[PDB]
């Protein structure tokens, strides 16, 4: 019953309770050296009193070499307001650029 959001929900605003966990699932292929990071370049929440985050990678069930898996970000809003979760698919030693893929979801808590 946790909200499960995927790349299709880029730009969505989800109404959520403070303390409620939201699961974001994004395609991700570690064999490229790219992964999803907060727009700033790390896996950590920009501010934990606003929302906390945990992350885990799941490889593809096919176990096929070179095949993409899925990263799961478990986000829990901790304060009322509308929180932008802004992620960017990057190689962490290069950082973002014009052609980097981005994902955003807004989490609105009362």
């Amino acid at each position: 019953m946790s909200h499960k959001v995927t790349k299709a929900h880029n730009g969505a605003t989800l109404t959520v309770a403070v303390g409620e966990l939201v699961e974001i699932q994004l395609p991700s292929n570690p064999t490229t050296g790219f992964a999803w990071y907060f727009e700033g370049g790390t896996k950590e929440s920009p501010n934990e009193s606003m929302f906390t985050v945990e992350n885990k990678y799941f490889p593809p069930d096919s176990k096929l070499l070179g095949a993409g898996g899925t990263e799961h970000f478990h986000v829990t809003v901790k304060a009322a307001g509308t929180h932008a979760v802004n992620l960017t698919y990057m190689r962490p030693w290069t950082g973002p650029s014009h052609d980097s893929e981005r994902f955003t979801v807004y989490l609105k808590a009362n």
Side-chain angles (χ1 to χ4, degrees), residues 1-40:
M1 203 155 167
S2 55
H3 289 125
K4 309 213 196 320
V5 353
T6 61
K7 185 182 296 195
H9 309 282
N10 194 13
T13 300
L14 279 40
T15 298
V16 79
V18 176
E20 181 179 337
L21 187 155
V22 172
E23 182 169 325
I24 302 166
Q25 300 173 352
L26 297 172
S28 187
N29 188 344
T31 69
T32 66
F34 284 75
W36 292 95
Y37 296 92
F38 279 92
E39 84 193 323

Side-chain angles (χ1 to χ4, degrees), residues 77-88:
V77 169
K78 301 282 184 157
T82 298
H83 305 271
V85 178
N86 301 132
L87 297 170
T88 301

Side-chain angles (χ1 to χ4, degrees), residues 59-107:
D61 288 350
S62 65
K63 298 153 182 168
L64 292 169
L65 294 172
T70 308
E71 284 186 67
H72 297 210
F73 287 83
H74 286 177
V75 180
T76 308
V77 169
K78 301 282 184 157
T82 298
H83 305 271
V85 178
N86 301 132
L87 297 170
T88 301
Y89 193 62
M90 64 182 76
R91 277 171 174 169
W93 50 85
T94 299
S97 62
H98 178 263
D99 289 314
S100 300
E101 185 172 351
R102 294 169 173 91
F103 176 83
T104 289
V105 69
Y106 299 99
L107 307 174

Side-chain angles (χ1 to χ4, degrees), residues 44-64:
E44 285 146 35
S45 169
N47 192 358
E48 270 183 357
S49 50
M50 296 294 102
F51 58 89
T52 55
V53 186
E54 291 143 66
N55 65 281
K56 41 184 186 168
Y57 173 75
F58 288 90
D61 288 350
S62 65
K63 298 153 182 168
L64 292 169

